[PDB]
Write a protein that binds this ligand. Structure first.
Ligand code: ANP
Ligand code: ANP
Ligand code: ANP
Ligand code: MG
Ligand code: MG
Ligand code: MG
Lengths: 37, 469, 488, 466
């Protein structure tokens, strides 16, 4: 039962989405910063 | 002694003997055929008639046709001269390279090594696969099980295990094709010929081939597993030498038998499998093991119908393994290879007093953060990435990285990924995950850890990633 | 002393029903030998039980009776093979049913021929172009491969095979003998009417002339449908054994499995999972292995199969369905969901793979088709959202564009060079600032332009099957300006 | 020669012959009986014994009873004098109007047209039903199947199709009642005599009725379809006319087959059915077809037991259809009639080269917005519609007006809808939807598109609502 949501569809694509979207910008957000450092 | 065929229904043929009745498990030669046709005595129906499963097609048999009892079970050629040669189910050579002039033949049927014969030694076997060696390490001379639904990576994974461990093996290795694709047999053969693990001009060949693929009637697929096992048996005993045994899909040993059960007159059991499913698998597995005479490092590929691990066939196969690497469509689907499940792959030596405390803690540390991350999969499935305390959303961010760092390019999978297969040393693997769990690389983007070798390339790639932006 | 019925070469029917005849006698028949019935009707002998032979009637069984004489044929079941069948429609045993007369056929081939062992094969390297972007760009097929089309009822399954066959006109009319492909269509448990369109269609695409349609419709006795596949396979093999390449289509192994079950049930063999025989797996694994790429020592020919599997309630996780899947080298999955959304052909990249992959793609296509596949499947990751940030808004900007560029018309296949030309226009981002719904209208205008004014440009890309520098330039020149004149 | 019953089990009767064994399909007549009792030879058991199937009850039979071989299958009257009459499995009239004096008779068993007799002509058959007309048009000479669960809409639809099509039909029709409600034949019969498609005085009747309702034993219900089928074949071939063949529930033909298969000695297939489900069915459906010699527009109602479309029966029926109209209880329960599934009904005629690109482009517009609304139902049930984008809400809204605009009041159902029947033209249906999609009516309330004919009546009802 740990991650049943994700082990399906409807709300999974969402969790999948928000997820990737987040870490998507974040990383770019972290990306240029790498340059700074 | 000569017998006559009295009934032919599929792979099941009835032969009646007037003289003497051959004992069960005895091989019978069907006379009058342009290709040796072996019939294995399966039962004694009574009234001097035995029932047998054909080791080939029955297309053409005639009621009354003669059948010569060879006196014993299927005996095949064993010994060093098999190395480099592709063998049949009944010992026939199928490489068109002529006969296999062997000086000894063993019966593919034999008793399993006694209990007093068991070995209790366990030495981790390093494979270069981070996930494997991290979470569920294989062990020297142990029984390795590779589970997986259709096309998730059983065949590619077992291939990597041969390109990694077999090529650098100081000894012989047996490979048995059990009801798979003949095309894969081609691939493996010519690819072993390239790497030089097989030599066609001399005697340096270090792997023996046994095949009985899909195009083959069940009867054959129902015994080849035992054939290949016999060849590796000789290498384990008559030498003691280290032997590696690769069987691509032992599941075809149980389906084979599931395809002839009824015709052997057997009420079907749960899920249609044979009632004898677990014990047939038992008198078959127990034979594939390390004794005090020598050691077998077996790697079996196990199919999982419709992806259901609870299916009788696979669920009965687990206890026969000392290390299991489970593949997951879900994981493969997230483009992570090998598609190994971190939460369902286990190993007997995964003990702190065998791999040390450092190795163990990190492994469980990986598994835990990955289980916690599954718990947040739900919570964030309705809320979004902006509700988790800075503490939780932090682990989510590490889960992703640890998840991605478990993936790894295979030398054998170049043609697929398009990248250069890497090979990771154990220590570099622990360090690798020890540091990520530490929080060190929380400033690096996840993608930096996806498909790489040691933890370094990660930073390096991460850099190549910073400059490109 | 009448000895024409000495129960050795002949037999007398004991019981007959549901297409099953138990024959007394036939003392010399072979397991799987053809037999002749009084009526002139034929049948196959599977059950060599002690007190009889279980004969399965290959036809209307209202003519057979108790006491009817059965005669051995002395031949395991076979069929007429050879290039004479090209352009003809035959029944499962190889008899013409298209009313055009005797089949030339000067050679027969056992329907149960064993499949090539290991040594005779060689790696699948030659492409099998469907002409369907989705396939050729993501699930590329190679000559000697066994790609399985699978899906719910009414989802495109068959159309893929039809667009594939038609697509073969190009080479077959060309000059390069090596790129020619002969196609064998096999209809199982289908409806005659349906097959009629089928062949009226291949005729309107002028593809019948290199196609051997083998048909065993709904009203045909089970064995004919069961045998159908191996019959067409055998025909495909003749080509695969003479330095030629044949593409076979087993239109519906499900129905074939159905018929097989029906036969087995009336032969009194215990039933099993969902009632099929014990060896239903062997039923298909035995047939699909015959598909293969022979090495130069064996002629170097091939036989590629596209068996079509039907699922119910979309359950790729059901008996037969998993039986075949775990056999073929991958599979193209169609879904009703993508069909109504507008994704036709309803191919769900997410589950569609080719265990040949790159191994089966030409230079040029590989170039632009570069990494569009994962990218598309990666667009799906973004699909769950659709104040997007311009960035991700972009990932969602290619996928919506390429998608339209992949849609296509039937009976109008494209030369691999024409496909590269348009795919190029999308993949190189040059259409990212265009209205999706406009993409299709554009491919048309564009193409008709390249094919008109720029015969030579295309004339190259093929010849070199590669997009050279000067060609990557002359194409950027055209899409961007043509496109703009289009958005006038 | 004389045959004698040696065993009786329900509707399976073994008859042993001492001389001259009747071939399979041959119709035997049981002797010593009040009314004609036919047995159909199904198989030769051996030992000069045949296993048959009774076409009527087998009560009263006694072992040793004599059975005669007619020397031919079940032959029924075919020809113009069948029109306006009602006949049973074995062609006996059951309308209390005396013998049916036809010249020719025909065996109810025959081989299907050959591959060379196949027709490839596709030409729409507009029905006045927006959902069918729109998404899955019926085809003249085509095989239309109407799947539906217990009480969902099959009958009413077949009736409406007889209203909107049969009447404006220039030729002969054949209605085959198979395993359904007898009082329904009663209904049909009297509705036809009213409208006049049946005439009991002048010989102008245009409908031939074959019946074997749910009151009949398995052998009958198992063959009635072939009888109605055979009566349709005469009109098609031996007269070359456009024949309409309605069959209310062909599923009963299969169901029946299962009852007897049991008794025939056949190991059962999946779900208890007979092994021969597929073939048995094929040899029949294949005869229901248009040839070069003539046409047959067949409309078959198909029962879905336990509302399970995967059930071997219906499942196996789709491949035999040119057009499918799938009815849904969930849709019916939302009060949408006809409960047609916009996303599971198909037509080989839904091809732009055939119905035009304007028609095809709208059809796909509708199946796209509904498809997209359907994929949102997961979110709507948990987080309501406040969690949907502005874009989403828009489709949801248009889907709901499209769903309702798909309903329609049929004449044959006025009593349950409380609305006067409606017959919508094709263009009017294309138009109505092109507009709802283009957002042209995004201002009208849902309830305005529900149960109405053209789009115009969607607007009228809107004002009334104010
Ligand atoms: N390590 C990998 N890297 C990339 N792709 C992989 C990898 N392993 C498997 N695949 C992909 O999955 C496909 C086939 O997987 P494969 O190893 O043959 O599966 P399998 O478990 O043996 N399936 P099967 O035996 O048919 O049930 C390949 O063709 C690849 O596309
Ligand atoms: N690319 C396409 N674009 C538009 N329509 C298509 C496309 N491919 C197929 N169709 C249509 O889809 C319908 C039926 O598809 P079809 O090829 O018969 O699928 P199927 O899986 O074989 N169905 P079936 O065998 O009848 O259960 C027909 O109306 C086709 O014209
Ligand atoms: N077009 C319709 N308009 C209004 N109500 C309808 C319509 N179609 C079906 N119904 C309703 O459903 C009921 C019965 O439908 P009916 O035509 O008899 O279904 P059926 O498919 O023949 N089912 P059955 O024969 O019992 O398996 C009617 O009494 C109506 O209440
Ligand atoms: Mg494999
Ligand atoms: Mg199809
Ligand atoms: Mg009804």
């Amino acid at each position: 039962s740990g991650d049943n949501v994700r082990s399906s569809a409807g709300a999974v694509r969402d969790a999948g989405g928000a997820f990737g979207k987040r870490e998507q910008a974040e990383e770019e957000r972290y990306f240029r910063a790498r340059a700074k450092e | 002694t000569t017998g006559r065929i009295v009934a032919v229904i599929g792979a099941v043929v009835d032969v009646q003997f007037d003289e003497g009745l051959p004992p069960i498990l005895n091989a019978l030669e069907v006379q009058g055929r342009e290709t040796r046709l072996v019939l294995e005595v399966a039962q004694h129906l009574g009234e001097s008639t035995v029932r047998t499963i054909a080791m080939d097609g029955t297309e053409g048999l005639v009621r009354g046709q003669k059948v010569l009892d060879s006196g014993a079970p299927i005996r095949i050629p064993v010994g060093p001269e098999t190395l480099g040669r592709i063998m049949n189910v009944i010992g026939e050579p199928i490489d068109e390279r002529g006969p296999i002039k062997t000086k000894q033949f063993a019966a593919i049927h034999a008793e399993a090594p006694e209990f007093v014969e068991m070995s209790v030694e366990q030495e981790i076997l390093v494979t270069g696969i981070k996930v494997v060696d991290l979470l569920a390490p294989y062990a020297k001379g142990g029984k390795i099980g590779l589970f997986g639904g259709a096309g998730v990576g059983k065949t590619v994974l077992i291939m990597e295990l041969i390109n990694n461990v077999a090529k650098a093996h100081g000894g012989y290795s047996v490979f048995a094709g059990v009801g798979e694709r003949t095309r894969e047999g081609n691939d493996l053969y010519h690819e072993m010929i390239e790497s030089g693990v097989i030599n066609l001009k001399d005697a340096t060949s270090k792997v023996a081939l046994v095949y009985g693929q899909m195009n083959e009637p069940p009867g054959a697929r129902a015994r080849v597993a035992l054939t290949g096992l016999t060849v590796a048996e000789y290498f384990r005993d008559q030498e003691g030498q280290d032997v590696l045994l690769f069987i691509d899909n032992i599941f075809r040993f149980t389906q084979a038998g599931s395809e002839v059960s009824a015709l052997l007159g057997r009420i079907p059991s749960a899920v249609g499998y044979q009632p004898t499913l677990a014990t047939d698998m038992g008198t078959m597995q127990e034979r594939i093991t390390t004794t005090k005479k020598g050691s077998i490092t077996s790697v079996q590929a196990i199919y999982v119908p419709a992806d259901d691990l609870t299916d009788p066939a696979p669920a009965t196969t687990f206890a026969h393994l000392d290390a299991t690497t489970v593949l997951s469509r879900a994981i493969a689907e997230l483009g992570i290879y090998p598609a190994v499940d971190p939460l369902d792959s286990t190993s007997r030596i995964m003990d702190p007093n065998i791999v040390g405390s450092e190795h163990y803690d990190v492994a469980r540390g990986v598994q835990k953060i990955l289980q916690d991350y599954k718990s947040l999969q739900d919570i964030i499935a309705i809320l979004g990435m902006d509700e988790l305390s800075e503490e939780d959303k932090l682990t989510v961010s590490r889960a992703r990285k640890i998840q991605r760092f478990l993936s790894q390019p295979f030398q054998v999978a170049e043609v697929f990924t398009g990248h250069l297969g890497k090979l990771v040393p154990l220590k570099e693997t622990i360090k690798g995950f020890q540091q990520i769990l530490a929080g060190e690389y929380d400033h690096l983007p996840e993608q930096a850890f996806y498909m790489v070798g040691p933890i370094e390339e990660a930073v390096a790639k991460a850099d190549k990633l910073a400059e490109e932006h | 002393a009448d000895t024409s019925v000495d129960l050795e070469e002949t037999g007398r029917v004991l019981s007959i029903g549901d297409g099953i005849a138990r024959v007394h006698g036939l003392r010399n028949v072979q397991a799987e030998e053809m037999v002749e019935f009084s009526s002139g009707l034929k049948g196959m002998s599977l059950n060599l039980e002690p007190d009889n032979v279980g004969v399965v009637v290959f036809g209307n069984d209202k003519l057979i009776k108790e006491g009817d004489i059965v005669k051995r044929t002395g031949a395991i079941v076979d069929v007429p093979v050879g290039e004479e069948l090209l352009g003809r429609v035959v029944d499962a045993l190889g008899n013409a049913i298209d009313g055009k007369g005797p089949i030339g056929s000067k050679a027969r081939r056992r329907v149960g021929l064993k499949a090539p062992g290991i040594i005779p094969r060689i790696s699948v390297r030659e492409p099998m172009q469907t002409g369907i972007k989705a396939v050729d760009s993501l699930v590329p097929i190679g000559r000697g491969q066994r790609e399985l089309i699978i899906g719910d009822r009414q989802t495109g399954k068959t159309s893929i095979a039809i667009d594939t066959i038609i697509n073969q006109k190009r080479f077959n009319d060309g000059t390069d003998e090596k790129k020619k492909l002969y196609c064998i269509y096999v209809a199982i448990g289908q409806k005659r009417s349906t097959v009629a369109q089928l062949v009226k269609r291949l005729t309107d695409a002028d593809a019948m002339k290199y196609t051997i349609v083998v048909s065993a419709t709904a009203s045909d006795a089970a064995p004919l449908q069961y045998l159908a596949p191996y019959s067409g396979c055998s025909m495909g093999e003749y080509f695969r054994d003479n330095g030629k390449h044949a593409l076979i289509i087993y239109d519906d192994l499900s129905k074939q499995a159905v018929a097989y079950r029906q036969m087995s049930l009336l032969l009194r063999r215990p039933p099993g999972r969902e009632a099929y025989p014990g060896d239903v797996f062997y039923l298909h694994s035995r047939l699909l292995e015959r598909a293969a790429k022979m090495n130069d020592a064996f002629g170097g020919g091939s036989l590629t199969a596209l068996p079509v599997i039907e699922t119910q309630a979309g359950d790729v996780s059901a008996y037969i369905p998993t039986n075949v899947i775990s056999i073929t080298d991958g599979q193209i999955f169609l879904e009703t969901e993508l069909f109504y959304k507008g994704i036709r052909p309803a191919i769900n990249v997410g589950l569609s793979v080719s265990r040949v992959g790159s191994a089966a793609q030409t230079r040029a296509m590989k170039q632009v088709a570069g990494t569009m596949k994962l990218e598309l499947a990666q667009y799906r990751e973004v699909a769950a959202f659709a104040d997007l940030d311009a960035a991700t808004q972009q990932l969602l900007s290619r996928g919506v564009r390429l998608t339209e560029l992949l849609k296509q018309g039937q009976y109008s296949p494209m030369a691999i060079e024409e496909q590269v030309a348009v795919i190029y226009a999308g993949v190189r981002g040059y259409l990212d600032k265009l209205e999706p719904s406009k993409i299709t209208k554009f491919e048309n205008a564009f193409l008709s332009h390249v094919i008109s004014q720029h015969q030579a440009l295309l004339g190259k890309i093929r010849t070199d099957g590669k997009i050279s520098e000067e060609s990557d330039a002359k194409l950027k020149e055209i899409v961007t300006n043509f496109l703009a004149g289009f958005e006038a």
